[PDB]
From a paper:
Here, we reveal the extended and contracted atomic structures of an intact contractile-tailed phage (φCD508) that binds to and penetrates the protective S-layer of the Gram-positive human pathogen [name]. The virion can be divided into five distinct regions: the head, neck, tail, baseplate, and needle. Structures of purified φCD508 virions in both extended and contracted conformations were determined by single-particle EM of frozen-hydrated samples; the resolution ranged from 2.6 to 4.0 Å for the extended phage, and 2.9 to 4.2 Å for the contracted form.
The 650-Å-diameter head is formed of a near-complete T = 7 icosahedral capsid and houses the genomic DNA. It is made up of 415 and 420 copies of two capsomer proteins, the major capsid protein gp49 and the capsid decoration protein gp48, respectively. Within the capsid of the extended phage, internal density shows layers of packaged DNA.
Residue numbers in the entry:
A (entry chain H): 2 to 44
B (entry chain I), E (entry chain M): 3 to 127
C (entry chain H): 94 to 288
D (entry chain G): 45 to 192
F (entry chain G): 242 to 288
G (entry chain N): 3 to 64
Write the structure that this text describes.
């Protein structure tokens, strides 16, 4: 009795996820040391 | 992600609705200038330009199909309520005559003494 | 749509918040730094590759760096912070560090550069279009005087608001994040470098 | 399992375009990033020897076969794990040339090429923390990694 | 009720608006199928099918007249900004040829390198 | 970007033996293993 | 089974090999008979009948 018969029936076969690093890079505020900030809602 | 440990296929969840479409941006050509809050036929779009724009500038037209007030009519033609209204780009004025003019709306208030009219902007046919 | 928020359990608002934050920060970097990159430098600011020599080590940018510092003290610019594409990081580090001996020429460490920064680009594919902020061009750098000729105007930092839903379609609130910001730069605070 | 299923995750996309006062805002999007897929194969080997050969060939015995199995086993282990590295049709990005090519060097000058690799593995974020090479170049790769 | 304890009269209050009409339900014919977030001319209604379907199935078309992003275009023709576009159902793609095709919008953003265009959807005249 | 999967590292078994030919047990050793590898970890050096 | 609360779709996993195929099973015709352990061409199969087969009786070839 081949294992290939049970290949398609993924429900019967145990499922394990291939652990891997997924995501996207975190962006950062590079400018800040250069610029001097002035904050005022009325500009 | 650059330099990720392993390849990973990116599946784009396609969507259609880029924007509500009330207003359309355009770029003025070498013979086109816009004053704020006026009607200009730019790139086949007829709407209320919301920005003062000289040639080569970037200006936003409003095409919300709401009710609009205007005064740029041709005074000879009598605009009655309900009559279809077209845009003559040669003279840059509204007009009741169809001819080759572009259909733009339907008049709600007839020509008053001051040549003001209120209409509704039809879609971009 | 509200169905998409409910049934698609992985989907939530937090992904949208994260992407808003990322795009927001990337555009902050763009508006603040793109004046530096895009500015049409004149001959007074540009400094050619003084480390040409003939068969110098690729830390010869050190030479090209040092002249630039002189080019700031002349005209009193006094550059203090370096910016350069991360591709040229290591060589710049080898210049900034105590670059090893070369034919007995113990080149000393360059000083009065308190900080270096690496503004590479930032690309994102939204829908069927790709929007990208250019980074520092490879093989270029900028000596910068800080905080005097550079001023950031912050009217509204970041305002995210839930907007016009449509109960007639069971569509959740449109979320819109907007900002009122600007930046002011200057030619009198920059010296360009090649490599 | 015979095949290990991939991971999945979601991200969003927005751009913050410049907003004219009359502008109609442009919406964002989402997308799904799926991990890779790994599978496990089967390897096997054996023998078929007549009992007469066992009986008379006094040199012959099972332990020789056990040693041969051990040798073939570890050889297959290292080959299956590393042959993807060697056999890969590397593109131009991963090919760091021989930067010891400066004329009349000392052959610890392969050091230069190694430095180029340490540069190229840091231009791209794929910082390589271990090296592999044919043992024929073990001397120079030592001299490069030492104080030449 | 049915077994009402007292005779009575029921008076109706007529009203014509039933829904905003932004989305139209349609039933797929035999020669029709729909993919999520794609344009289809089903029964004279052109819009973005929001659910996958097959023969004899029921789906929802969005006809909001907003701005939509798409690339299913005859790439030979140049879709400059502002030009009218017609759905050719035989080829199942946007064109600028008209002929017997169905006028389905006007382009806001011209054809980029990837043949992607942003266009406003006309209201199904 | 490198991962080794080991389901059955090594099993050796003794099996069929045609007594009509006076043949000893067939011996078979086998393993269940897999390797995942990528180009996102490597740089090819020359010399 | 019969008293199933839920409809169930059966998933029939196939396997072509059914038996080793050493012994082919045949039926004795009218004009044919077999003895124990003897060669017979029954239904195009030549083999050693291992049951004394009468007409219409059953046997086991090899």
């Amino acid at each position: 009795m081949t294992f290939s018969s049970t290949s398609n029936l993924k429900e019967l076969l145990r499922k394990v996820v291939l652990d891997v690093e997924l995501g996207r890079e975190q962006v950062q505020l590079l400018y800040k040391p250069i610029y001097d900030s002035i904050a005022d809602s009325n500009l | 992600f650059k330099g990720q440990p392993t390849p990973s296929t990116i599946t784009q969840i396609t969507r259609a609705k880029i924007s509500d479409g009330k207003s359309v941006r355009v770029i003025l050509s070498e013979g086109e200038s816009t004053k704020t809050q006026q009607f200009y036929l730019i790139n086949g779009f007829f709407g209320v330009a919301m920005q003062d724009g000289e040639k080569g500038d970037e200006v936003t037209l409003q095409i919300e199909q709401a009710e609009y007030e205007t005064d740029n009519i041709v005074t000879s033609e009598a605009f009655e309520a309900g009559k279809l209204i077209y845009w003559d780009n040669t003279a840059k004025k509204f007009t009741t005559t169809s001819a080759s003019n572009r259909l733009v709306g339907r008049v709600t208030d007839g020509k008053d003494s001051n040549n003001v009219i209120w209409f509704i902007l039809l879609p971009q046919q | 749509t509200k169905e998409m928020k409910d049934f698609n359990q992985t989907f939530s608002v937090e992904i949208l918040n994260k992407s808003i934050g990322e795009s927001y920060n990337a555009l902050l970097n763009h508006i603040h730094l793109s004046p530096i990159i895009n500015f049409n430098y004149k001959a007074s600011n540009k400094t050619a590759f003084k480390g040409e020599t003939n068969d110098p080590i690729w830390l010869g940018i050190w030479r090209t760096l040092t002249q630039a510092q002189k080019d700031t003290v002349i005209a009193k610019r006094q550059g203090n912070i370096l910016m350069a594409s991360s591709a040229d990081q290591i060589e710049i580090e080898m210049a900034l560090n105590g670059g090893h001996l070369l034919n007995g020429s113990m080149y000393p460490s360059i000083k009065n550069i308190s900080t270096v920064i690496y503004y590479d680009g930032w690309e994102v594919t939204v829908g069927k279009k790709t929007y990208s902020y250019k980074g520092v061009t490879p093989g270029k750098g900028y000596l910068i005087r800080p905080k005097r000729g550079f001023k950031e105007l912050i009217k509204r930092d970041l305002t995210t608001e839930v907007g016009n839903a449509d109960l007639s379609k069971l569509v959740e609130n449109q979320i819109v994040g907007h900002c009122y910001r600007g930046a002011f730069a200057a030619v009198e605070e920059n010296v360009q470098e090649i490599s | 399992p015979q095949v290990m299923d991939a991971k999945w995750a979601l991200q969003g996309n927005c751009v913050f375009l410049e907003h004219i006062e009359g502008e109609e805002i442009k919406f964002g999007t989402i997308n799904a990033e799926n991990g890779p897929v790994a599978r496990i194969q089967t390897y096997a080997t054996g023998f078929e020897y007549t009992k007469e050969m066992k009986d008379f060939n006094q040199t012959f015995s099972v332990e020789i076969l056990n040693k041969s199995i051990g040798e073939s086993y570890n050889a297959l282990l290292n080959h299956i794990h590393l042959s993807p590295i060697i056999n890969f049709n590397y593109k131009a990005s991963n090919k760091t040339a021989f930067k010891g090519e400066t004329n009349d060097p000392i052959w610890l000058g392969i050091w230069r090429t190694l430095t180029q690799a340490q540069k190229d593995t840091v231009i791209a974020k794929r910082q390589g923390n271990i090296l592999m090479a044919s043992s024929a170049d073990q001397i120079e790769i030592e001299m490069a990694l030492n104080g030449g």
